[PDB]
Design an enzyme around this catalytic site. Structure first.
Site, mmCIF file in Angstrom:
data_model
loop_
_atom_site.group_PDB
_atom_site.id
_atom_site.type_symbol
_atom_site.label_atom_id
_atom_site.label_comp_id
_atom_site.label_asym_id
_atom_site.label_seq_id
_atom_site.Cartn_x
_atom_site.Cartn_y
_atom_site.Cartn_z
ATOM 1 N N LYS C 122 -14.034 -4.680 33.097
ATOM 2 C CA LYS C 122 -14.245 -5.278 34.254
ATOM 3 C C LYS C 122 -15.750 -3.602 34.959
ATOM 4 O O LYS C 122 -15.961 -3.568 35.890
ATOM 5 C CB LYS C 122 -13.860 -6.924 35.221
ATOM 6 C CG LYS C 122 -13.049 -5.190 35.733
ATOM 7 C CD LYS C 122 -11.114 -6.363 36.466
ATOM 8 C CE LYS C 122 -10.156 -5.615 36.014
ATOM 9 N NZ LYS C 122 -10.175 -4.225 36.409
ATOM 10 N N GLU C 206 -14.652 -7.479 50.899
ATOM 11 C CA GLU C 206 -15.617 -7.602 50.288
ATOM 12 C C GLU C 206 -16.479 -8.715 50.904
ATOM 13 O O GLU C 206 -16.068 -9.625 51.577
ATOM 14 C CB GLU C 206 -15.083 -8.654 48.683
ATOM 15 C CG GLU C 206 -13.961 -7.774 47.969
ATOM 16 C CD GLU C 206 -13.385 -8.750 47.142
ATOM 17 O OE1 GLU C 206 -13.330 -10.023 47.232
ATOM 18 O OE2 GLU C 206 -13.204 -7.969 45.542
ATOM 19 N N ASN C 241 -12.818 -25.240 36.346
ATOM 20 C CA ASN C 241 -13.349 -23.705 35.470
ATOM 21 C C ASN C 241 -14.127 -24.014 34.384
ATOM 22 O O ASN C 241 -14.648 -23.074 33.971
ATOM 23 C CB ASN C 241 -12.356 -22.078 35.553
ATOM 24 C CG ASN C 241 -11.937 -21.900 36.993
ATOM 25 O OD1 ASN C 241 -12.905 -22.437 37.585
ATOM 26 N ND2 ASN C 241 -11.039 -21.521 37.063
ATOM 27 N N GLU C 281 -24.807 -13.955 34.588
ATOM 28 C CA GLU C 281 -24.489 -14.923 35.789
ATOM 29 C C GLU C 281 -25.395 -14.593 37.195
ATOM 30 O O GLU C 281 -24.384 -13.551 36.978
ATOM 31 C CB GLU C 281 -23.769 -15.938 35.381
ATOM 32 C CG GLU C 281 -23.389 -17.205 36.352
ATOM 33 C CD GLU C 281 -22.123 -17.777 35.684
ATOM 34 O OE1 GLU C 281 -21.433 -17.368 35.096
ATOM 35 O OE2 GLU C 281 -21.655 -19.187 36.159
ATOM 36 N N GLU C 294 -20.671 -11.804 36.190
ATOM 37 C CA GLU C 294 -20.261 -11.968 34.062
ATOM 38 C C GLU C 294 -21.813 -11.653 33.531
ATOM 39 O O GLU C 294 -22.751 -12.342 33.828
ATOM 40 C CB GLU C 294 -19.616 -12.988 34.037
ATOM 41 C CG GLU C 294 -19.495 -13.530 33.354
ATOM 42 C CD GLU C 294 -18.285 -12.197 32.209
ATOM 43 O OE1 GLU C 294 -17.564 -11.801 33.276
ATOM 44 O OE2 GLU C 294 -18.697 -12.072 31.063
ATOM 45 N N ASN C 296 -21.943 -12.865 29.579
ATOM 46 C CA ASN C 296 -21.882 -13.549 28.057
ATOM 47 C C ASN C 296 -23.023 -12.836 27.054
ATOM 48 O O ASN C 296 -24.058 -13.247 27.774
ATOM 49 C CB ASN C 296 -21.686 -15.400 28.524
ATOM 50 C CG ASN C 296 -20.847 -15.435 29.255
ATOM 51 O OD1 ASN C 296 -19.630 -15.527 29.757
ATOM 52 N ND2 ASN C 296 -21.445 -16.651 29.828
ATOM 53 N N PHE C 354 -9.027 -35.122 35.910
ATOM 54 C CA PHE C 354 -10.123 -34.804 35.470
ATOM 55 C C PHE C 354 -10.201 -34.424 34.133
ATOM 56 O O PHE C 354 -10.550 -33.402 34.295
ATOM 57 C CB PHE C 354 -10.851 -33.916 36.286
ATOM 58 C CG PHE C 354 -11.302 -34.671 37.996
ATOM 59 C CD1 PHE C 354 -11.253 -35.625 38.002
ATOM 60 C CD2 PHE C 354 -11.488 -33.591 38.612
ATOM 61 C CE1 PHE C 354 -11.785 -36.352 39.567
ATOM 62 C CE2 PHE C 354 -11.322 -34.323 40.765
ATOM 63 C CZ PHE C 354 -11.619 -35.343 40.466
#
Ligand SMILES: *C(=O)CCCC[C@@H]1SC[C@@H]2NC(=O)N[C@@H]21
Lengths: 247, 261, 673
Positions: C122, C206, C241, C281, C294, C296, C354
Site C-alpha cells: 500500500k 485526510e 464488503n 477503482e 486500489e 485489482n 444478510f
C-alpha cells in the site's frame, strides 16, 4: 407429469466409496410422479422404508433399503414390516417397486436369541409368494443371502436392473482373501486381484442375474415401460386350501 | 486301455467310502452316522430306489479338475421310498466331502426331487447336515439357495414338509428348514445360526460360544424355532417314523384313519 | 477471429467453479486442448467432465488442495502443458507461484511479477500513484498537537475530513466535520480521549468523501506498451464488503468525467508496465470528484458485464496477448452498446445477517436460457452439491437491453423463471432491491442496503392489490388440486359419480390473519371473491410443472408451488418471495377452532447453530453465566466467519461445541437456564 422424463440428479447420488452412506429416500422422491410419497410407519424400523406412490398415474407400493441407519442391514422389525406391506399389496393387486441396498443380516446375540430366522423367513416368504408385477433395482450393494431374500431374480422376478455402481458378493473380501489362501499368506497382489475381478456387476451380468446395466438418469422411463408391458401377469399355481406362513 | 466297467466300479467304491476309511472311522467315533445308512434306517427295508446316483460338480476355476478334490455324488443323497407302505421323498445332506457345501448340482437335484414330489403328491423329508459353502464357486452357489426357497413356497399348504437337522448348519441355508412345517433337532449335534460366533465376537465384542448360540436347547427353549430335541440320531429317526405316520400324504387326502380297539 | 493464427496447444486451468468452465469453453472455441485439475470433493464437477484430463491435486481442504505448489508442478510435468490459467482468487496473485512458474519453460497468463509486487503493498502503491499523476485521496498524516494548525490544514483540504489517528482517536477529526468550531471541539475532545484510550493525541489529516460510490475502470495492456480502457462499471451495492449487483454503464458520471478517468487509469497502468487485464477503482463523491483507491490485477467475477457493452471477450484476448501478439483495436473504437445488469446468485439465507452461508444438495436446477437477453454463468448442474470448503456462489446472471429499464425488466423476468430446489438462496434479496424506487431512480451509495434495512431483510412487503392477487392464486391452485383428484378410470362394477358444487367457500390464513374466500370454476377460468373483491384467473393449470404462469385480471404472474401438505399448509414462491398459507374449508376451520392448541416450549434458552459450519473457538465453558451482547463461539464456514451473542442472561447447563468439532444444521450447541 411426463412418463419419459430424465432424472440427471441420480448420476452422482451414490458415492463410490464402499463405506459412504446416502439418503435413499431422495431416489424414491425423484423417480415417482409429482415428487409425492406417502410413507407408512416411518418412525419404526427405519432400516427399511415402505410406502405408497404413483407412477404414470398408477398406484404402486415402494419398498426399499436405507443405508443411513444400521448400514442398511435388515432385522426382525424390518422383516415383519416389509412382509406385511408386501402381503397387503399383493392381496389387493398393486405392483411393487423394490430398491435393494443390503450388506446382509445384522449379527448379534440379541437377534440370534429373538429368532431372526423366523422373521427373515417371513420376509422371504412375502416376496416369494407375491404374484403382482414387481420391478427391482440394485443401486450399490447386495451381499450374502440377503440379496436372494430381497426379491431376487430366481424368485419369479420380472425385470432386474442394476446401476453401474452395483456389485454382488458373498462374504467380505478382507476375510475372503485370507480364507482362500489357506496354504500360506498373500498380501497386496491377492487383494488387488480380488478387487479387480469380483468388485463389478460383470460376473452377475454375464450370468443372467440382471437384465442389463442402465444409466441412473434413465431409470424412471425403463420402470414405466415395465408397468406398461407386465400388467397381464397371470400365473398358475397348484391348488391349496391356505398358505402356512411362518408366523 | 481299461474298460469303463473298472472306472465305474472305482467311482462307486470311492463314493461309498467317501474320502477314505480314515474319515469313515473318524465320523463313526465322532458320534454321528453318514447319510446312506440314515436313509436305509428311516425307510422300509428293500424299498429305496435312488435317482441320479452319478452326479458330480464341475468347476474350471481354482484348478479342482484333479482327482484329489473330485468326488461323485455332490454330497447329496435323494430318493423315494415307502414307510409303513406310504410313499415318501427323502433327502439327506452328506458331510463326507466339502462338508455338505451346496453347489449347482446340489440345488439341481434338490429341485428335481421336490418338484417330482409336488407332481405326485407325496411328503418331503429332509435331513440337513452342512457346515459351510464353497467360496470358490461364489455368488453362483448363492443363486441355488434362492431356487430352493421358491420350491418351498410353492409347496406350502400342498404337501407336508418335514425337516430334521442333524449338523452344524449355518449361513443362508438356515432358511429352507424354517420355511417347512415342523423342525426337529438332535442334542449337541445340530446347530443353527445365520452368522458364526467369530463375526459376532469381532463386531459386537462379547464372549460367546457356539453351544449357547445355536444349540438345540437354546432354539427349543427360548428362541422358539424348533419343535422338539432328541438325544441322538437313531431315536430321532424312530420318532420321525411314527410322527410321519400321524400325518396325511397331502391336503387333498383326508385325515388318516387307524384301526382302533 | 481467425483460428489459423498460431497459439498454445495445451492450456492448464488451475481454478475451481464457473470461471474454470468459462475458460475451458472459450479455449475449446479457439481450438486449443484443455486440461483441468480438481480437488477431492470436486471429482464429479462440471469442469472436470468438460475438459479432457482430470488431474487430482489432493485432499478436500483448500489450504492444502488448490494452494499447494508441488502438486501443480507435478500436474504440469505429467501434462507438459505449455501454459496455465489461474482465474481469480486462490493463487492468481501469489508471487511465489509466479516466480516458480517462470523458473520452468512455461508462460503464466497474466501480469508480470513486478506489477504484482508494485500493487500488493500500500505505501509503495501510493507512492507510484503519486508518481503517476493520478488524483488520489489527499491528507496530511503528520503530528498536529495544536487546534489552529489542524483547522488550517482542514480548510486547506476542505472542512469535510477523515482526520484520524494511527492507533485511533474515537473519530478524531472525522466526527461532525462540517463546520470548523466543532472541529476544534472534536480536536480537544479527541485529544482527551486518545490520552485516555489510545495515546496519540495528534491528528492525521485526510479528506472526506460524501456518500461514496465506487466506479471501476477496466484496463487492458499488451507487451508492446499499448493500453486500452474498456468503459466503466458501477458496483455501489455491497454487503459485508462484498459486491452483489453491478451495472456496466454508470449514470452518475457523464462523458467527460468517464473520459478523464479513462486517461488517468490508462496512465496508471502504463506507469507500471502492465500487461493482460486489470481494473482501477475510484471512490467518486456526490460532486463528481473522484479519488483513486486500489488496483485489482486479475480477471474479476464481474468482468462479463463490460463485455456485454463492447462485443469483445476478455479471456481469449488475454490468452492471445500472453503469446505476444499486439492488440488490434484502438481507444477510438470502443463504444457503448446499450445497457447491462449482472446479479450474483449465492447459496445463503438473506433473512439472517444478510446471507448466512448454507449447504445441501441441489435437488433440481433449471435456468431461463430461452428468455430474451439473458446469459448465465453457472458452475453447477442438477444433482450437484455445496461443501463448506469453497465459495457458496451458485451462479451469475447477465441481462442486456437497449436502455436501463429494458435491462432491469429482463433481469426481473429472468429472476422469476430461475428454479433452484435443494438449497436456500438470496433471490428474494436481489428481486426486492432491484425494484427499489431509489435504485431505479439512481440514487445509491456504499451503505445503500445498510440504512434502508435497519432491522435486516424482512421479505418483500406486499400491498393490498397483490395481497388479493396472492390469495386468489392460492385459492385457485387449491381448488385445482382438489378437482384433479376426482378423475379416475371406469371401474365397470361400482360406478363413480363426480360430486358437483357450484362454488367453494374457503378460509385462507396468511401470516397472522384469516380471510374468507369463495372460488367458482368455469372450466379453465377461476372467479375468486376475497373480502368483497372480484378477481379472475386463467391458466393451463399444469400441476406437475415446476413453475406456473397465471393471468390475474390481465396481469401475468409467474409463480411456483412447493411443500403442498395434505393438511392445508402450502408454501408459494410469488414475486420472488416464499409465503406460507393455510387453506381450509369453512366447516374444517369451524371445527379447528375447537381443537386445543398444541403448546410449544421454545423461548430462547437454546443456542443451536444458526446454520452449519465448523466451530473454531469457544469463549464460554459449561456452568458459566454470560450477559447480553457477548458472543458464544466463532464458526468458520466456506471462507466466512460469524460470531453470535445471546439475547438473555443465564447460566449454561451444557456446551456441546469444542475446538475442532463439526456442527450440523440446527444441531444443539448451548443449553442454558
Ligand atoms: C474460493 O473459492 C476463492 C474465493 C473466490 C472469490 C473471488 S476471489 C476474492 C474476491 N472476493 C469475493 O467476494 N469474490 C472474489
Amino acid at each position: 407429469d411426463p412418463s419419459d422424463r430424465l432424472v440427471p440428479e441420480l448420476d452422482t447420488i451414490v458415492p463410490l466409496e464402499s463405506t459412504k452412506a446416502y439418503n435413499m429416500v431422495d431416489i424414491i422422491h425423484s423417480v415417482v410422479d409429482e415428487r409425492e410419497f406417502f410413507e407408512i410407519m416411518p418412525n419404526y424400523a427405519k432400516n427399511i422404508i415402505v410406502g405408497f406412490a404413483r407412477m404414470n398415474g398408477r398406484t404402486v407400493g415402494i419398498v426399499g433399503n436405507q443405508p443411513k441407519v444400521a448400514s442398511g442391514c435388515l432385522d426382525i422389525n424390518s422383516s415383519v414390516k416389509g412382509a406385511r406391506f408386501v402381503r397387503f399389496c399383493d392381496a389387493f393387486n398393486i405392483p411393487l417397486i423394490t430398491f435393494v441396498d443390503v450388506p446382509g443380516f445384522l449379527p448379534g446375540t440379541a437377534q440370534e436369541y429373538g429368532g431372526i430366522i423366523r422373521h427373515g423367513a417371513k420376509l422371504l416368504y412375502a416376496f416369494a409368494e407375491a404374484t403382482v408385477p414387481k420391478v427391482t433395482v440394485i443401486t450399490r450393494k447386495a451381499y450374502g443371502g440377503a440379496y436372494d431374500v430381497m426379491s431376487s431374480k430366481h424368485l419369479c422376478g420380472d425385470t432386474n436392473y442394476a446401476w453401474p455402481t452395483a456389485e454382488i458378493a458373498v462374504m467380505g473380501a478382507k476375510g475372503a482373501v485370507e480364507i482362500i489362501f489357506k496354504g500360506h499368506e498373500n498380501v497386496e497382489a491377492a487383494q488387488a486381484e480380488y478387487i479387480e475381478k469380483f468388485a463389478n456387476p460383470f460376473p452377475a451380468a454375464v450370468r443372467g442375474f440382471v437384465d442389463d446395466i442402465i444409466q441412473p438418469s434413465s431409470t424412471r422411463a425403463r420402470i414405466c415401460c415395465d408397468l406398461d408391458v407386465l400388467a397381464s401377469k397371470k400365473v398358475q399355481r397348484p391348488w391349496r386350501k391356505h398358505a402356512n406362513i411362518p408366523l | 486301455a481299461t474298460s469303463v466297467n473298472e472306472r465305474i466300479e472305482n467311482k462307486r467304491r470311492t463314493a461309498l467310502l467317501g474320502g477314505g476309511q480314515r474319515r469313515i472311522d473318524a465320523q463313526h467315533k465322532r458320534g454321528k452316522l453318514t447319510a446312506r445308512e440314515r436313509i436305509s434306517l428311516l425307510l422300509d427295508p428293500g424299498s429305496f430306489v435312488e435317482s441320479d446316483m452319478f452326479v458330480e460338480h464341475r468347476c474350471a476355476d481354482f484348478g479342482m479338475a484333479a482327482d484329489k478334490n473330485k468326488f461323485p455324488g455332490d454330497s447329496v443323497v435323494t430318493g423315494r421310498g415307502r414307510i409303513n407302505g406310504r410313499l415318501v421323498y427323502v433327502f439327506s445332506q452328506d458331510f463326507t466331502v466339502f462338508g455338505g457345501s451346496l453347489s449347482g448340482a446340489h440345488a439341481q437335484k434338490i429341485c428335481k426331487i421336490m418338484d417330482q414330489a409336488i407332481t405326485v403328491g407325496a411328503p418331503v423329508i429332509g435331513l440337513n447336515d452342512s457346515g459351510g459353502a464353497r467360496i470358490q464357486e461364489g455368488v453362483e452357489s448363492l443363486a441355488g439357495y434362492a431356487d430352493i426357497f421358491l420350491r418351498n413356497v410353492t409347496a406350502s399348504g400342498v404337501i407336508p414338509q418335514i425337516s430334521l437337522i442333524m449338523g452344524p448348519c449355518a449361513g443362508g441355508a438356515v432358511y429352507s428348514p424354517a420355511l417347512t412345517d415342523f423342525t426337529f433337532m438332535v442334542k449337541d449335534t445340530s446347530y443353527l445360526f445365520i452368522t458364526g460366533p467369530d463375526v459376532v465376537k469381532s463386531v459386537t465384542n462379547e464372549d460367546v460360544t457356539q453351544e449357547e448360540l445355536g444349540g438345540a436347547k437354546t432354539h427349543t427353549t427360548m428362541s422358539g424355532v424348533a419343535h422338539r430335541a432328541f438325544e441322538n440320531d437313531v431315536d430321532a429317526l424312530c420318532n420321525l417314523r411314527d410322527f410321519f405316520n400321524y400325518l396325511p400324504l397331502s391336503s387333498q387326502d383326508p385325515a388318516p384313519v387307524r384301526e382302533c380297539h | 477471429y481467425d483460428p489459423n493464427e498460431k497459439t498454445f496447444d495445451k492450456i492448464l486451468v488451475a481454478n475451481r467453479g464457473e470461471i474454470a468452465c468459462r475458460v475451458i469453453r472459450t479455449c475449446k472455441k479457439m481450438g486449443i486442448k484443455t486440461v483441468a485439475i480438481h480437488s477431492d470433493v470436486d471429482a464429479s464437477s462440471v469442469h472436470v467432465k468438460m475438459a479432457d484430463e482430470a488431474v487430482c491435486v489432493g485432499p478436500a481442504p483448500t489450504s492444502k488442495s488448490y494452494l499447494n505448489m508441488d502438486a501443480i508442478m507435478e500436474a504440469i510435468k505429467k501434462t507438459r502443458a505449455q501454459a496455465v490459467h489461474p482465474g481469480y482468487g486462490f493463487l492468481s496473485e501469489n508471487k511465489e507461484f509466479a516466480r516458480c512458474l517462470a523458473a520452468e519453460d512455461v508462460v503464466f497468463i497474466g501480469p508480470d511479477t513486478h506489477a504484482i509486487q508494485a500493487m500488493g503493498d500500500k505505501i509503495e502503491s501510493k507512492l507510484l500513484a503519486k508518481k503517476a499523476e493520478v488524483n488520489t485521496i489527499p491528507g496530511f498524516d503528520g503530528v498536529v498537537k495544536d487546534a489552529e494548525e489542524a483547522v488550517r490544514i482542514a480548510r486547506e483540504i476542505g472542512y469535510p475530513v477523515m482526520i484520524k489517528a494511527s492507533a485511533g482517536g474515537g473519530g478524531k477529526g472525522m466526527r461532525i466535520a462540517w463546520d470548523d468550531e466543532e472541529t476544534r471541539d472534536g480536536f480537544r475532545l479527541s485529544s482527551q480521549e486518545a490520552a485516555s484510550s489510545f495515546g496519540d493525541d495528534r491528528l492525521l489529516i485526510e479528506k472526506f468523501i460524501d456518500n461514496p460510490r465506487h466506479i471501476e475502470i477496466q484496463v487492458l495492456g499488451d507487451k508492446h506498451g499499448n493500453a486500452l480502457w474498456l468503459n466503466e462499471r458501477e458496483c455501489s451495492i455491497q454487503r459485508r464488503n462484498q459486491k452483489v449487483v453491478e451495472e456496466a454503464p454508470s449514470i452518475f458520471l457523464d462523458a467527460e468525467t468517464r473520459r478523464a478517468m479513462g486517461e488517468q487509469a490508462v496512465a496508471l497502468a502504463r506507469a507500471v508496465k502492465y500487461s493482460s487485464a486489470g481494473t482501477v477503482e475510484f471512490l467518486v463523491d456526490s460532486k463528481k470528484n473522484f479519488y483513486f483507491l486500489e488496483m485489482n490485477t486479475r480477471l474479476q467475477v464481474e468482468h462479463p458485464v463490460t463485455e456485454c457493452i463492447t462485443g469483445l471477450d476478455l479471456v481469449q484476448e488475454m490468452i492471445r496477448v500472453a503469446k505476444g501478439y499486439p492488440l488490434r483495436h484502438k481507444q477510438a473504437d470502443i463504444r457503448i452498446n446499450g445497457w447491462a445488469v449482472e446479479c450474483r446468485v449465492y447459496a445463503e439465507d438473506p433473512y439472517k445477517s444478510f446471507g448466512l452461508p448454507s449447504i445441501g444438495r441441489l435437488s433440481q436446477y433449471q435456468e431461463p436460457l430461452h428468455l430474451p437477453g439473458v446469459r448465465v454463468d453457472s458452475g453447477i448442474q442438477p444433482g450437484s452439491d455445496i461443501s463448506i470448503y469453497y465459495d457458496p456462489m451458485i451462479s451469475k446472471l447477465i441481462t442486456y437491453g437497449s436502455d436501463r429499464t429494458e435491462a432491469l425488466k429482463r433481469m426481473a423476468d429472468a429472476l422469476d423463471n430461475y428454479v433452484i430446489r435443494g438449497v436456500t438462496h438470496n433471490i428474494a434479496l436481489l428481486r426486492e432491491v432491484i425494484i427499489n424506487s431509489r435504485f431505479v431512480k439512481g440514487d445509491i451509495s456504499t451503505k445503500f442496503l445498510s440504512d434502508v434495512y435497519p432491522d435486516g431483510f424482512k421479505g418483500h412487503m406486499l400491498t393490498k392489490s397483490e395481497k388479493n392477487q396472492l390469495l386468489a392464486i392460492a385459492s385457485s391452485l387449491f381448488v385445482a388440486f382438489q378437482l384433479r383428484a376426482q378423475h379416475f378410470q371406469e371401474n365397470s362394477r361400482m360406478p363413480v359419480i363426480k360430486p358437483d358444487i357450484a362454488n367453494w367457500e374457503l378460509s385462507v390464513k396468511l401470516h397472522d390473519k384469516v380471510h374468507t374466500v369463495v372460488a367458482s370454476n368455469n372450466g379453465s377460468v377461476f372467479s375468486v371473491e376475497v373480502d368483497g373483491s372480484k378477481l379472475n384467473v386463467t391458466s393451463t393449470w399444469n400441476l406437475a410443472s415446476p413453475l406456473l404462469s397465471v393471468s390475474v385480471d390481465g396481469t401475468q404472474r409467474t409463480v411456483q408451488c412447493l411443500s403442498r401438505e395434505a393438511g392445508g399448509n402450502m408454501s408459494i414462491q410469488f414475486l420472488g418471495t416464499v409465503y406460507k398459507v393455510n387453506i381450509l374449508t369453512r366447516l374444517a376451520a369451524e371445527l379447528n377452532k375447537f381443537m386445543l392448541e398444541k403448546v410449544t416450549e421454545d423461548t430462547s434458552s437454546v443456542l443451536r447453530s444458526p446454520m452449519p459450519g465448523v466451530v473454531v473457538a469457544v469463549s464460554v465453558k459449561p456452568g458459566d453465566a454470560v450477559a447480553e451482547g457477548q458472543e458464544i463461539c466463532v464458526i468458520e464456514a466456506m471462507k466466512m466467519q460469524n460470531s453470535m451473542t445471546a439475547g438473555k442472561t443465564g447460566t449454561v447447563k451444557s456446551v456441546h461445541c469444542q475446538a475442532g468439532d463439526t456442527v450440523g444444521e440446527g444441531d444443539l450447541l448451548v443449553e442454558l437456564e
